[PDB]
C-alpha cells in the first residue's frame, strides 16, 4: 500500500560529558578547590562532521563559572573545564540558516562521580527534523 504522510528526516547525535578526577598535581592556574577535569560535547557518530547542519552549540554552565553562556561556533562542539561539582547544563543546538529552525533545547547533568580513572555520561539519540524545507533537505542528504 501507499499513503502520503508528513516528511521527516532524522540525524543521529551523541552528547554528554567525560570526566576525570585530577591527581595530586593539578594543571597550572586551576582554582585550588577544583577537583575534576571534564568535557561536555555534542558530536556525530564515529566523530563524523555535524557542522553541515549544526551552526553552533551553546552550553550554559552553572553560575559559579564566569561567562557561563559558552558559545561554540565551529567544530568540535565541545568545551573542557575544571570544577568541583556536578550540575545541570542546558545545551542549545542552533541549526544552519537554511534550516529555518528554532533552537533545539536539551539538558545534561554533568557526571563526575565514579561508577557503581575516567567516567562518562553519554547519550546516543537522534534529532528528528519535522517538515524540512527543500533546501535544508538537500543539505541533510549531502552526508
Amino acid at each position: 500500500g501507499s499513503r502520503i504522510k508528513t516528511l521527516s528526516v532524522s540525524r543521529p547525535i551523541i552528547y554528554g560529558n567525560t570526566a576525570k578526577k585530577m591527581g595530586s598535581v593539578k594543571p597550572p592556574n586551576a582554582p585550588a578547590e577544583h577537583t575534576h577535569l571534564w568535557t561536555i560535547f555534542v558530536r556525530g557518530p564515529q566523530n563524523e562532521d555535524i557542522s553541515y547542519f549544526i551552526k553552533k552549540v551553546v552550553f550554559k554552565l552553572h553560575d559559579t563559572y564566569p561567562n557561563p553562556v559558552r558559545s561554540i561556533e565551529a567544530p568540535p562542539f565541545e568545551l573542557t573545564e575544571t570544577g568541583w561539582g556536578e550540575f545541570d547544563i542546558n545545551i542549545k543546538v542552533y541549526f544552519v540558516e537554511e534550516a529555518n529552525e528554532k533552537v533545539l533545547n536539551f539538558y545534561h547533568r554533568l557526571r563526575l562521580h565514579p561508577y557503581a580513572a575516567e567516567v562518562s555520561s553519554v547519550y546516543f539519540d537522534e534529532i528528528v527534523f519535522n517538515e524540512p524545507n527543500e533546501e535544508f533537505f538537500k543539505i541533510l542528504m549531502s552526508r
Binding site: 575534576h36 552553572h62 559559579t64 561539582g85 556536578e86 550540575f87 557526571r111 563526575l112
Partner: peptide, 5 residues
C-alpha cells in the same frame, strides 16, 4: 551544583 560522591 553539588560535589560528587
Amino acid at each position: 551544583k553539588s560535589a560528587p560522591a
